[PDB]
Paper text:
CCs are quaternary structures comprising two or more α-helices supercoiled around each other with cyclic (Cn) or dihedral (Dn) symmetry. Here, we describe variants with all combinations of the aliphatic residues, Ile, Leu and Val, at a and d to give four classes of peptide: the ββ class, with a and d = Ile or Val; Lβ, a = Leu and d = Ile or Val; βL, a = Ile or Val and d = Leu; and LL, a = d = Leu. Peptides are named systematically appending the one-letter code for the amino acids at the a and d sites to “CC-[name]-“; e.g., CC-Hept becomes CC-[name]-LI. In summary, solution-phase data and X-ray crystal structures demonstrate conclusively that different classes of Type-2 coiled-coil (CC) peptides—i.e., based on abcdefg repeats with predominantly hydrophobic residues at a, d, e and g—adopt a range of distinct states.
Residue numbers in the entry:
A (entry chain G), C (entry chain F), E (entry chain A), F (entry chain B), G (entry chain C): 1 to 30
B (entry chain H), D (entry chain E), H (entry chain D): 1 to 29
The structure:
């Protein structure tokens, strides 16, 4: 319910964090 | 309930961290 | 229900985080 | 059913994340 | 229940780890 | 039954993973 | 059944990984 | 069936990651 929706919101933010981290890693690779 | 509010707070923080990493990645270009 | 759906979305996001962290490890190494 | 499927996908992601943590730990030294 | 508690604790830890990665990245970029 | 016991053991192991991940996040600071 | 047994096996493995990660983190702290 | 086998394979790999990480920790000291 409220917990499931908040976990979905957390998951989406975590996914976006992952993609930003990968972008940073790739910038470190030039 | 209390767990839902905590998860929302963590999501908020992750959004902020992701923006900073994207700024850092641009700085390395 | 929605809880299982949220757990599946959490799993996908955590998988993306795994790939991102590996990329960062690659960038640190070489 | 869908809950068992979600648990299995979550376990797989936990395993992949643990592998990445192990890889990251190796890279730190 | 305990699984919901565990997901919350793990989400909290992921968030703290994400902060630590962001700080590490900040140092690497100068 | 045995599934509920397995889920409880999984929840407790996930909490241990949470504790370890917070420990690792702190170790990146220093 | 076998799913619950395998989930218990996975939980034990996850606990062992968490302990190893915690040990690494605390060794990194010094 | 397939889910139980998957979980067992993940568990086997997880413990192997743990043993590698334990070795990394010992090398630090």
């Amino acid at each position: 319910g409220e917990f499931a929706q908040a976990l979905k919101e957390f998951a989406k933010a975590l996914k976006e964090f992952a993609w930003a981290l990968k972008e940073f890693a790739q910038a470190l690779k030039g």
